[PDB]
Symmetry: C6
Subunit: 264 residues, 6 copies
Amino acid sequence: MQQNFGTALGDGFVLNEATLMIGALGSALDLTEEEHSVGLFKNLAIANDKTFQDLNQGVTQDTVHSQKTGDNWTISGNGYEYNPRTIMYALGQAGFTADPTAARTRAVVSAPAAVGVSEISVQSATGLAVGDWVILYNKLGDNNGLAYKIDAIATNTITLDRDLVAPVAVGDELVKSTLINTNNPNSCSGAEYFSAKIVSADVNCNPIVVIVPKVQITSGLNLAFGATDYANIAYQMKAMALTRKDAGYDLYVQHGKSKVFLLT
Amino acid sequence: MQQNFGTALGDGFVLNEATLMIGALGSALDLTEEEHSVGLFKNLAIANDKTFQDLNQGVTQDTVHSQKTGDNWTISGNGYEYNPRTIMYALGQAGFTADPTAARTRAVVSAPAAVGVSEISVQSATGLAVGDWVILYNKLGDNNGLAYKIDAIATNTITLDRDLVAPVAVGDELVKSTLINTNNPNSCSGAEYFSAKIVSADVNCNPIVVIVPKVQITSGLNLAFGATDYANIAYQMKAMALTRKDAGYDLYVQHGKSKVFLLT
Amino acid sequence: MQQNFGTALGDGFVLNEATLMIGALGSALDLTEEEHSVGLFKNLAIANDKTFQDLNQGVTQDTVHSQKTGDNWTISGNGYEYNPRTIMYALGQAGFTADPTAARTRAVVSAPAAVGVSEISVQSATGLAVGDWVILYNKLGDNNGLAYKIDAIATNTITLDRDLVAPVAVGDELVKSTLINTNNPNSCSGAEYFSAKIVSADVNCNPIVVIVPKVQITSGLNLAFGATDYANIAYQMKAMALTRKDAGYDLYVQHGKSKVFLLT
Amino acid sequence: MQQNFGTALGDGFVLNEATLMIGALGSALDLTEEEHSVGLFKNLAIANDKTFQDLNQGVTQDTVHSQKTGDNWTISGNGYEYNPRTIMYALGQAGFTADPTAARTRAVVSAPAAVGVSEISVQSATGLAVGDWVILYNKLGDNNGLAYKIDAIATNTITLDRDLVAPVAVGDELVKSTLINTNNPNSCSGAEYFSAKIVSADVNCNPIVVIVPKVQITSGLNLAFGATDYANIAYQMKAMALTRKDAGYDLYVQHGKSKVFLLT
Amino acid sequence: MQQNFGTALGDGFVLNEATLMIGALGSALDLTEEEHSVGLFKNLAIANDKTFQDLNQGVTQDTVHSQKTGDNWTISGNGYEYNPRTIMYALGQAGFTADPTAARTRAVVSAPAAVGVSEISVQSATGLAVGDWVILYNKLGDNNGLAYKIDAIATNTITLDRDLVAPVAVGDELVKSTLINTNNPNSCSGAEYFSAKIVSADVNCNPIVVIVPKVQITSGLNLAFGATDYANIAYQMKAMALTRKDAGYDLYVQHGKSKVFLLT
Amino acid sequence: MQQNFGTALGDGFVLNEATLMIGALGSALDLTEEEHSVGLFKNLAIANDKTFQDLNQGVTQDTVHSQKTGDNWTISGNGYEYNPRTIMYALGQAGFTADPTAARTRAVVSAPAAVGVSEISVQSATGLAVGDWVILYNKLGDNNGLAYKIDAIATNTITLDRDLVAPVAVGDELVKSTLINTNNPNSCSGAEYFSAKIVSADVNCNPIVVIVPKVQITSGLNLAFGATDYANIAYQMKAMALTRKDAGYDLYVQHGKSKVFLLT
C-alpha cells in the first residue's frame, strides 16, 4: 500500500561535460571546435542571479508590486592546457588567432660560442626568421632560462639582440618560442568582448546548445606550480547586453533581447 | 523503577518525499501530477520565519506588548530533469504549457551538402514545419553544435536560415529542438505568479496536502557539468498575499487570509 | 601519595530526557501528560543569559557598581510527530484543543463518478458530517492529492463543494482530514501566551519539575522531506513576565516575581 | 655531536584537576571542601587578559611610553551535579547555605484520594512540616509531575494547598522537594559577590593554592537533556577589585592590591 | 631528458627547537641558560609584519613612491613548567631573580592542635623563618588547601598569623611555599622591559643566535587543568625601539638602530 | 553512440616546480641560477587580479562602458634554506651579494681562559680577520650562544670586544659567523626594488620563462621552530610599473608597458 512521491516523468537527466567555444563578436552561432575551442575544460557551471524590488503596505508588509532590477549570468571552469591560445584567452585577449597545435623548431649549434659574443652558428636556419624569439637549451649545466631575439640571419650565422652571459657549446639547441605581453596597448579601455557557445548532451544523446552573444572575461592568468597535481587555470565570464553599435545586435533583438538562449 | 520521559502519544511520523505541483493562478486546488508536476524532486523543505516587535518597560525590560510584523514562507528543493517545462519553471515562466514527454523527430540526409549552401535534401519532411529549430548531428567528426532554423520546405528540400560553415555528408541527422529565451518581453515587470500544491503521506499512508494560492520563483537557472554526479537545479519559492484583482482572492479570504493552509 | 582533586560530594547526576507540557494561561501547576503533552520530544535544553551594567573609575577601570539589566529564558527541542495538536503548537496556536489519537473515517465509493459531476455515492455516511474535509484516495493511478469539502449529505449521496477534475471509480476511498489555517483572524496582534511545565528525573529516580507561568512560541512550522532520516520540528520558546491583567499573576508575585522556579 | 635546545631545568609540571571553593565575602583563606566546594568539577581554566595604551612618534611609530589600562581574570569549568547548592551557585545566589547530601523523606499513602479533594492520609508525618513541598509519585500511570505545598498537618491527615486533578491510590509516595526561585527579591541590584579558592598539585605532589578575594558569577543556569552523555553546567566567574566598604579590604591592600595571588 | 627545477644550492636546513633566555635590560649579549632560561619551551616562532604607504597616479594607479610605516617583531611559544620564575615571567615581572631548582622544607608536627589555636609544635624549625608561608598537608582527610604565615618562632613552637579552622594531628607536614602577587605596586605604569636571546642550530650543527635588546611581554598567566594532557603557558613578546635613557642604547645605534639582528 | 565533450586539443600540460631568480634592477633577462637563485623553492604561484568600473543605464542596469582600473601581479612560495642570502632576500635587502656555499672557519683553543679576561689563544688565525664575528662552541656544558667580535689579532692571541662571562677550556672552538641587521640605514624610505625571473617546463620539456622587470618583496622574516617538520620561509612579491628614472625602462616600453611578459 506504500506510495512513491516525487517520481520522474521523463528521461532528460544530465551526466557529462561541456565544451566551451569563444570567438569573435557577431559569430556566436558559427563557432567550430577546432578553431574556437579552449581545450581540456572541466567543471563548467552556469549561474543566474536575479534581484527584485518590492513595495509593501501594512504592518505585516503585504507586497503589492515587485519589479526586477537585474539578472546576471556567469560562466566558470578549469582549463588544463598552457599554450598561446589559452594564455591569451585567460589574459582577456583574442586567443583564437593563435593555434594550440603549432610546432617548435629546435635548431642545432655547430660551433662553440664564448661569453661576450652576439653571433652563433647553426646547422640550418629553416623555420627561423628575423624577429623570432629563441630559448637556449643546454645539454649539460643548470637551466638559467635565457631568451634571445633574432636580429639578422646571414647564411648559417644568427645575430642575437644582446651579448651572451653563458657559453654555448656544440650540441646545444635553440628552441623557438612565442612572446605574450600581458598589456594590450591598442585597447583604450582594456575591456574586450567576445561571443561564446556551450555544447553538451543528455544521457540519451540529445544535444544541448547554449549561445551567449556577448561575454567579458573578468578573471586573470593564474599559474600554480607543484608536484601534487596538474596545474589549471580558473576561468570566469559574464554576459552583457548588446548595444546598437555592437555586432550581432540583430540576433539580440530577434530573440527578445535575451542575454542567453537555449536550444534543448 | 526507571521511568521514561518524552515518549510518543501517537503514530504520525513522516519519512518520505513530496511532490510539488505548479500551475496557473486561481487553480491551486485542482492541480494534477501529469499536467502540473515538476518531475524528479528531492529534499523538499518548507520554512516559516516570524518577526515580532516588543514594547519594554523598566530597567529589566519587562515586555508589556508584542506585535507580529511579518511571517514568510519559503519552498526549496532539487530537480533532476532538464526538459523545456523544468527550464521554463526555473526561469520564472509558465512551464506547464510545455510537455516533458515530447518526441524529437530525427530526419535523415540523402544528399551531401558543401560549405556555402543553404539548402539540404532529407528523406521525408514529416514532423518538421516552417520556423522549427534543428541541430545537425554528424556521425563522424567533432561536435560543433550547429543549430539552424527552417525557413521554407518544398518537396524534400529544406532551406535553412543561414549558409553552412561545415559540410554535411550522407547519413547525417537533423534533430528537432525547442528554443527557450531567458527574457520574456511580454512581462512589463518581470515577475510572474503561480499556484502551488504539495502532496505527501505519513508512515501509515495518511495523506498530507499543502496548498499555496500564490508563489513567486526567486531562483534562476543553474546548470553545472561534471562527471562525478548527476546535475540538478536548485529551486526557491516564496508565498505572497493575494489582492483584490488577483485570481483566487475568494479562496484567500475564505480561509482567514492565510498564505498557506494544511490538510492533515 | 597521589591526591584526587574536584571529586564528587553527592549522587545527583542527570542522564535522561524530559517531557514538555504546554497548556492554557493560569494552569501551569495542573498540566497533565495526556491532555497537554507535545509527544516525542528530543534534546530539550534550557538556557539563561544575564546582562550587567558596570560603573568604572580610574585608569585601570575598577568597578564600583554593577546593575542587572535583564535575564532571558529560552526553551528548545525537536518534535517527531505531525498531528493537528503539534502543528497548532508549532504555529503559535492553542494546540491542546485538538487530539493526537483521533481516528480517520475512510468511506467506500459504491458508484463510479465521471469528470464534471459534484455528487458521489458512498457505502455509509457514518462519521462524516456537513462541512468536513475529505481527501480522495485512488487505488490505481497517480496521487494528485485532491481535497473536497462536504456541502450536503442526503441518504448515501454526498455533494462536494466543487466539480471533479479526475474520475472516481468503484473501490476508491474518501479519507477524512482536518483543516489547519496558518493565520489566526481572531488575534489582533498575532501573539498568544501559554503556560509550560517540564518533568524529568535524576539517576536515582528523584523527580525534577520546572514551571514557567508564561511562555511565547517564537518559532514557526518547519517541515523537511527526505529519505535519509525522520522529519522533525524545531521548537523555541521564551519566558516573559506577567502583568496585572494576566492570569496567574498571584502565583507570579508569590514566588518573588520569578519567571522560572524549580522543584528539585 | 647533536645538541638539544629548549630542555627542562626542573620538574614542576602539572597534570591534574583542581577543586573550586566558593564562600562568603571576607573568608577567602578559610574555605573548606565539605562546606564550600562545588562538587564534580571538570576543565577548570584561569585566563588573564591585559590591555596597554601606547604613545608613538615618527613615521615608523617608535613607542615612547606604554600604560596599562586594565587586567581581567576569568574562571570557567563544568559541573556535573544538580542539587540545591549547585543550582543556587549557578543562579548567582548563596549556595553554601544548602547541603548536597540532604535526604528526601518519601511518605506512604494509606488511603485512596479522588479528584477534587485537598486532604490525604499518610502512614506517618515524620520529616514533613508545614510549608514543605512534596511531589506526588504514582506507581502506575504517566508521570505528570505534580507538586503540592503542605498547609496543615493534623494527626495523619495532610491538607494540600490546592485541589487534586489526578487520583492518588494506595501505595503512592510523596517525595519531599526544595523550592528554588530564579529571582532574588532581597537584592536591589541583582549582583552578589563571593570569595573563591582553587586547590591543585604538581606531579611531585606539591600543592598549588589560588585565592581570589572577590568574584562575580556572570553565567546562568544551563540544563540540557539527552541520552548521549551526562548533563553539566558551564560556570563563568570574574575577579573584581575590593573597595573600602567591602569585607576583606585589609587582605586586599596587604598584598599590593592584587585581584589574585598564588602560593606555589 | 627530464629537468629538475627549484633545487637546493646548499645544506642550511633547520629542524630543531630553540632556547629562549630573558634577562635584565642592557645585558642582551651575556645571557646564560642556567640563570636566564625559561625552561621547557616548545613551538618558538618569530614573526615580522611590515606596512607600506604608496602614492599612486593615473587611472591604473601606477605607484611612484612607497614608504615604510612600521615593522613589528613578535615572539611566541609554549612553556611546560610551573615554578616561581616562569610564573613571574608570565606575569610580566622580573623572573630571573627566583630559582626553578629551589627546595621545599617539609617540617613534621609532633603535637596535635585543635580548632581555635594559633600555635603549633614541630620537630625542628630548620629552613623556616619569620614571614614565611607554609601550606598544611594532612595525611588523612580532604585537602582544603590552607596556607599560613609564620609570625614568630620560639624554640619548637610556631605561631601562625590566624586561628586554625581544621585540626592538625600528629604526623602532618608543613610544606614551605612562595607567595606571588599578580600586581606590582612599585611600577607606576605596569609595563616592564627586558632583554631576550634565542639560540638554535642547523642540521649540520651550525649555531643560530638571535638577539633582541628590548622586549615587552604582552601575554598573561594562563593555567588550564585537565586529565588529557600536560598544562602549558602561552607566551607572547614584542620588540621595541630603545631610547636615550634606556640601557643598551649604544648597542642599538651601533647596529643601525635594528630591533633584531641575527648571527647565522 | 556516446560522445565526449571538453576534450584536449594539444599536449601542453604542466606538472613540475619552478625556479625563482632575483637580481639587480635592469638585468631581468640575464639572471643565472648560481648567482641569483633563491634555492629550494616550493609551491610557486602567480596570481592576477583585475578591477573594472562599469557605467550602467536603465532599471535593469545595462552596461554601456567598462574601464579597467588596475591589474596586480603577486608571486608567492616557500623557501627551505636559511643562509645569509635567503635571509637578506626575506628582509627586503640585496641578497645576491652574499653566497650560500660559503665556509665556516672553526679555530681551536690551545690555552684555557677564565672569567673576566678578554684575550684568547688559538692554534692558528687563518681565515679570521679584524672585525669578524665568532660564536663560542663548548664541548661540555650548556649552550649559552655567546658571540664575540674580534678587535685585534696579534700572533696567536685574539682580543675580543667584551670580557668573558663563561670559562673557555682547551679544545673549544670559535665558529665564524655573519652579522645580519634587520634595519638598513642607507635606505631613506625602506623600499628596495629588484628584478625577477621564473623558469619551468612542460611535460614535453618545453621551457617556460616569465620575466618581471620590477618587483617588491612585501613579506618579512618568518622562522618557526619545531620537531614535526622542516622550517620554511613564506615569500611574497608584487610587480610594479617602471618610471623614467628606473633602470630597464627601455625594456618596459618596448613590450607595450607590460609588468609581466611570458615566453611560452
